[PDB]
Symmetry: D2
Subunit: 726 residues, 4 copies
């Protein structure tokens, strides 16, 4: 039952493009990629080659194919301890998934700051540009279970665990800069409304159902993050191509004791990019693991996810200087008013070895801060501080979840806590309490100070009566959705209209749709009217006369809110499909592959069957996938070289591949006789912006395609796609 | 610094006698003691001296005395993550106790065979007299909770984990050679009957209640082990002075495939010794931790518990040679018929560092066997095989309880099991199934063989129908109880009678007592009449005429069944109380301590207050405890030196000390005017056997006392003790 | 039939003095003692007389004495679903004990006010003397495990659950009027110092050990409750003869919104009474269930524990 | 047991039998039924041995396994008839 004689079962332990080798555990794929956290996990890494199969008690197994029975056709016997331990472990494999963010994908990496930030914070991980901090990052969706699809419309989580010399700091953020609700007390109501409805547990991974829109229509504080979710921000192309945000205002505390308010940002160095709805939704069917796969394969290829940490900083004396409350997590701070200061870079450069042990069991919690940081009274942040530790208790089995290897600090940890389920650490301290004399009071408290000090809270003044009451300053719900709307390009606005229209069409109770449209009329009447037209709703005279909400501190738009208004495209790590024929013109394929290689763009060679085809010069070309098996959904652009085009000219899958790519706004390039495919996408002979065509592939043809790919999608084609049957 | 300036907070890291120093974690008390398992635990041992106090995430704490509040008389705030982590861990410290044997005391040690047993077993741990195998041993009671008392009347558990090079072997035995029941189906019934009654949860630690004796009276198979429990075997002096037994017949399998039946024995090298019932019972009140303390203090003193492993071996062809079924766990194999062959020595030489992490979390299970051993169809053993894996699941939190450090093998273990709560090992195998080609099928099965082979079951023939039926050969209940009863000394018989008499007097429903007396009359009429007289019950003419059961294979006694018939007294590690007065004669004390020291016997110097006293010659004498503080129950003998005897002659506690010791059959030695105490225990002037007396405490005064100690207790005193008001 | 012909296996369902009859579940000893909470539990009470022995799935069992085997001296078979269920249930009977107060004894009863307290509180259970509120009360020690002894020297817990028409109110108190420490951040340190020491898990049920006195010596705020514990308050004669206190100042709030500060007390109508030390210590050996037994038997006798 | 939290999963409403169920099993996490039987073991006399075993019969009888003949040696072996 062995491996093939040629060694082809084992992936090369070097960087390789997606599809070139089977994927593997990180420590086998990239054994030389190290950091202090990855090294610390070596105590618990288990090999396998050359080892005997055993029970968990170390007894070697002779026959792992059969249960013990009284005769070979007889009953199974109770005394088969080998069968019993294997089946017992299997029967207890599953642990509860996370209440929210159950679907997620993670990797290891490292961070380092660009310069010391000691004038604004004493946090050790930001004190020295040459001090590197290992990280572990998990990206997630919010609503769906751990077996749900990746490219759903949803907010995404972006959680980073920094293993610092002064403790673990978890920055537990999302990919939009606000949340849906203002006070943690409402979190279970909001989550219950977006999650599958309770009688039948439908729908998975979707906010397109009555209960979500019922809640939104009755809680207008949700409308800002709803706008984000209905835009193409809700359907990122990759976890590499979305922004992150801590949402809450936190504090930085320097060695002099000065507090500065801060909001955290991650900027993707691969740039911002999103799918379009129909593409996203079909990809949940054709590849429900698309983002998990893309992240893993980018790290294997050396296309490491990179992100810049950024801080918006506000001095303490400017707390009340905006027209919204800084402590309101439904409000963003526009970068036109407070710029994001660049702070450091994070690089994700190694995949885990075992998804369950490292990803599934990782525990992130925003209460895990370090000296030099502090909280604020944001009432959503305040309630989060209760929930992360308590949940990690039923999910991970007990109070020792910090001893699960992925969660362990790499700095020292010593205290008087003892026992609890699955206790690993064996304490030798004669004392388990303090103050004690019997161990000379060790381990000891440490006064706060500029470095290596004990944690002390910032001594914020508190004055008020004990109340359950929302601050009046939080009761403004429409100005930030309007600012967002007006900062989007015209095509992004169209996609927001379509996202609300699609979702509310799936709400069965028509009055809920009408109440959402009335909320939209309080944001922008153009938006309201465009959604109402798709729902066959007519706005009333009163609704047409609602006064628009005020500008946000004088702003009419802020272009940093748009994905696309400011070009930021980076083609390295993108992928093109190359549709082969049985006699490819090898000069075209040479020119194509050379130009893609120079820009770090990968190729996938597709055909109508698997195996190999031979080019005109004898080059044998292995086929990555069939046209049906790896649809246009999964690539960024499509190139069709010349050769024997008659082999594929009448193939329905090949023609549909181009039609889907065209409808989804992807760049298409056709060389030579492949130009006959222009006819299937039912447009021009003089050509069209977005379709690169030439007698042969070459420097100029590839340059033009690569420039298209740098702009991500061909937005100009939008009006030509409603007629295409695809 | 809170430690005293003179360093007297820290115990000496060297062997010291009981009470000389405070006790400590084993690796701090005996850092030079090692073995392969202790060395492998080093990676999870945590120190304390010189480290900062932190959260579990490694953040240094500055103030561990106060919660975060809004003003120093204000409400506590939810953002106090340091308080929250500390209270959350504490809130979750407890795990379920074991269903039975919840009260237990454990130690590390090692085992070595005296010679290779390869002719009868291929078990690696028995293959070489130079091969030393680490062990971890837990002794326990059965019925009471983890917080119940040590010196109850009960069966004791004796469980040994051997960390072999071919797997963990757990020998999970008790301190009697049979069990109460024949088939595992009845275990919940028996245990429910012995355990506190379900309406009110009384009594703890005791079988002296209606439900236990109701079950016994209805299930005469229980009578053999009940006889053992009612004897002084139910009240051992120490875990170091009891026997252990595997109970079941197992098999040894050699390299040629030959099976030999085997029953396992532990022989205590300190000899056999037990308390008397009134002493045991009072000790549960004065020191409920007396056996746990004694085991720990013996190891800290260097009085290491030592046991010889022995095998009773029966050839396969002798399966049916006895009057009873070898597979019946209510029958013993008399050592007159099959002698115990010595196999090796186990020495327990290190205490744990942390009781919870190493004792509470240890998991022993008799299904953990290694190549060279195998099971038999004993129907109690068969059912045990189901129970120990399952229970260790709710108890220890999941299917990865072998990764808890004390449970881990020291030999390699590799397999395709994955996940489960609290998974520590991070598997790098590309495959999690076999057969596989992707990892060339590793880890791989191993054929059985003479050494280092895979486990294969012995191919025993099975023939019969699927039935729920007890074998007729098991249906004999009285002959082994009678052999036991006949093998006892007269004083041991008297204690058995008194054990039954006391227990049945606590049974509230009189017919249950009557039904039990009827079962006794099927064993031995003398026994049944003596118990009946104590209960005011008169035997009928029919009961007086029940034919005794037959002898066992012609035996009418076997002295190996008695604790005391064949003297095996060791005094090393025993303890003597020395009662001081305010002006002790130093020449007496010097003599006493010198002789005790030469024989390895400990002393505790007692008085009517703490502090010190001064001898006649000015020597300062440190007092260990007061008369009331360390009662006679806790020592093996009592010595009173001369001096100012009028200081203590009318001290009620000093008098009571001697009466208690006397009642409990302990040797008592009186020097000089300490002979005035004869009147308080009613001793005549010619003296009496068991009271050592003289003008001073030498020539042969110490030799006579140490001779009485070697014989444990003064049995011949028993007729005199009923008069003494104590 | 295994019961004796004369029926002396079954205690009479009428009050009887301690030792006169075997003790029995409450609903069999006193079937006509009722309150709203005891009546609401009727849906989950299960009987036994005249019913067949079954699996948990309702399958009747024919032989509850033997495992299924291949021949009557053969190996046990994995298809024995009856054995498997019965052993699986037994293997999971235990749950974690309480972190503190693990040893306790409980009874049902009821509470009634002497007068309407509406001028000081709007709490509905205090609003009318004819309003009866069921209670369930658990008394406990603090340090020992659930199988430790009753007459140790310790603080005792006195916890009452009031099943009111406006919600459950739990009054979770002890038998002395203060506690050992000031701020909850220190609770795990104090409890760890009083509990059995971590290396060897001794001593059970006792504060007479180095780490407790270490902490006391270093934390003089403890000294007041230590005084109480070393007095005979630390060794009550019975749960019926000790006082109870909520310890903390709470607030009462009336219908006008006025707050009054309040501390809560329970006064034993049987009076206050304690053991002496040598008697208490010896009793932990002769009857470690002494307090649990005394409470049960007092109720079976009609000597109901009463507290104001 | 691990999925549903303990050995009393039969008392979760959807899993409950609609016929009678009585036995001597007790306790476990999440125990809903409050047993009033003085006995939690059998054989017992203190409750006249109830609940009681029921012999097999044509209707409403105790379960008994069919007495199939077993013959062979203790082996980990796939029957050749399955190959
Ligand atoms: C700004 C608003 C919030 C953001 C950005 C946020 C972000 C996230 C992210 C990214 C995760 C997944 C961490 C991972 O990958 O494992 C998560 C999990 C969780 N969140 Fe939050 N969340 C927010 C609000 C809240 C609120 C208000 C609560 C409850 C009061 C909460 C309770 C949870 C819980 C229960 C989990 C599961 C944690 C676990 O099992 O380990 N979240 N959150
Ligand atoms: C010969 C008869 C038996 C002997 C000598 C025996 C011995 C022991 C001993 C010494 C322990 C304590 C191990 C330790 O110190 O942790 C124990 C625990 C246990 N026994 Fe047995 N026992 C016997 C029969 C049974 C049977 C028939 C069953 C169930 C079918 C059973 C179920 C258990 C369970 C559930 C535990 C607690 C295990 C744990 O939580 O780790 N015992 N037994
Ligand atoms: C005046 C001070 C306190 C008193 C009077 C008090 C009283 C009690 C009582 C009577 C019980 C047992 C309830 C029962 O019978 O089930 C109990 C249990 C408990 N107490 Fe407190 N206690 C106090 C302080 C604390 C503090 C400061 C903490 C933690 C910060 C705490 C945590 C606990 C916990 C964890 C249990 C176990 C509860 C359970 O498992 O159900 N106690 N306490």
């Amino acid at each position: 039952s062995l491996a093939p004689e040629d060694g082809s079962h084992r992936p090369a332990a070097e960087p390789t493009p997606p599809g070139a080798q089977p994927t593997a555990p990180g420590s086998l794929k990239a054994p030389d990629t190290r950091n202090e956290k990855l090294n610390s996990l070596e105590d618990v890494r288990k090999g396998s080659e050359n080892y005997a199969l055993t029970t968990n008690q170390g007894v070697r197994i002779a026959d792992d194919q059969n249960s013990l029975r009284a005769g070979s056709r007889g009953p199974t016997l109770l005394e088969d301890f080998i069968l019993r331990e294997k089946i017992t472990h299997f029967d207890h494999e599953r642990i509860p998934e996370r209440i929210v963010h159950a679907r997620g994908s993670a990797a290891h990496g490292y961070f380092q700051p660009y310069k010391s930030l000691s004038d604004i914070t004493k946090a050790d991980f930001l004190s020295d540009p040459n001090k590197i901090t290992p990280v572990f990052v998990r990206f997630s969706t919010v609503q769906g279970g751990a077996g749900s699809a990746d490219t759903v419309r949803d907010i995404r989580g972006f959680a980073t665990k920094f293993y610092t010399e002064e403790g673990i700091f978890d920055l537990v953020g999302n990919n939009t800069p606000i949340f849906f609700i203002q006070d943690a007390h409402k979190f279970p109501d909001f989550v219950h409304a977006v999650k599958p409805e309770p009688h039948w547990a439908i729908p998975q991974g979707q906010s397109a159902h009555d209960t979500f829109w019922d809640y939104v229509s009755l809680q207008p504080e949700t409308l800002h993050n709803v706008m984000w979710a209905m835009s193409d921000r809700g359907i990122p192309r990759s976890y590499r191509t979305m922004e992150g945000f801590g949402i809450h205002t936190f504090r930085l505390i320097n060695a002099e004791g000065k507090a500065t308010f801060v909001r955290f940002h991650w900027k993707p160095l691969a740039g911002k990019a999103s799918l379009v709805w129909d593409e996203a939704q079909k990809l949940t069917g054709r590849d429900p693991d698309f983002h998990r796969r893309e992240l893993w394969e980018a790290i294997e290829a050396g296309d490491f996810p990179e992100y810049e940490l950024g801080f918006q900083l506000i001095p303490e004396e400017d707390e009340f200087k905006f027209d919204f409350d800084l402590l309101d997590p439904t409000k963003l701070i526009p970068e036109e008013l407070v710029p994001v200061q660049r702070v450091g870079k994070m690089v994700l450069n190694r995949n885990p070895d075992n998804f369950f042990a490292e990803n599934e069991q990782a525990a992130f919690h925003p209460g895990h801060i370090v000296p030099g940081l502090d909280f604020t009274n944001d009432p959503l942040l305040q309630g989060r501080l209760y929930s992360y530790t308590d949940t990690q208790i039923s999910r991970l089995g007990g109070p020792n979840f910090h001893e699960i290897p992925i969660n362990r600090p790499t700095c020292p940890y010593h205290n008087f806590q003892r026992d609890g389920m699955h206790r690993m650490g064996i304490d030798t301290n004669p004392a388990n309490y303090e103050p004690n004399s019997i161990n000379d009071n060790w381990p000891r408290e440490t006064p706060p100070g500029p470095k290596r000090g004990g944690f002390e809270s910032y001594q914020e003044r508190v004055e008020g009566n004990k109340v359950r009451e929302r601050s009046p300053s939080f009761g403004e719900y429409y100005s930030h959705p309007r600012l967002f709307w007006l900062s989007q390009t015209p095509f992004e606005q169209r996609h927001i209209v379509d996202g609300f229209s699609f979702e509310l069409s799936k709400v069965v109770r028509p009055y809920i749709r009408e109440r959402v449209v009335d909320q939209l009329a309080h944001i922008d009447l153009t938006l309201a009217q465009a959604v109402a037209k798709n729902l066959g709703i007519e706005l009333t005279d009163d609704q047409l006369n609602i006064t628009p909400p005020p500008d946000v501190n004088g702003l009419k738009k802020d272009p940093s809110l748009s994905l696309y208004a400011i070009p930021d495209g980076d083609v390295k790590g993108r992928v093109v499909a190359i549709l082969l024929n049985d006699e490819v013109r090898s000069a075209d394929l040479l020119a194509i592959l050379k130009a893609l290689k120079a820009k770090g763009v990968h190729a996938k060679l597709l055909y109508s069957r698997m195996g190999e085809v031979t080019a005109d010069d004898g080059t044998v070309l292995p086929i990555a996938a069939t046209f049906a098996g790896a649809p246009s959904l999964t690539v960024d652009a499509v190139i069709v070289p010349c050769g024997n085009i008659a082999d594929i000219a009448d193939n329905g899958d090949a023609n549909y591949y181009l039609m889907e790519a065209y409808k989804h706004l992807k760049p298409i390039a056709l060389a030579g006789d492949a130009r006959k495919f222009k006819a299937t996408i039912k447009i021009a002979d003089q050509g069209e912006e977005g379709i690169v065509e030439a007698d042969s592939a070459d420097g100029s043809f590839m340059d033009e395609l690569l420039t298209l790919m740098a702009a991500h999608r061909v937005w100009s084609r939008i009006p030509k796609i409603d007629k295409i049957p695809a």
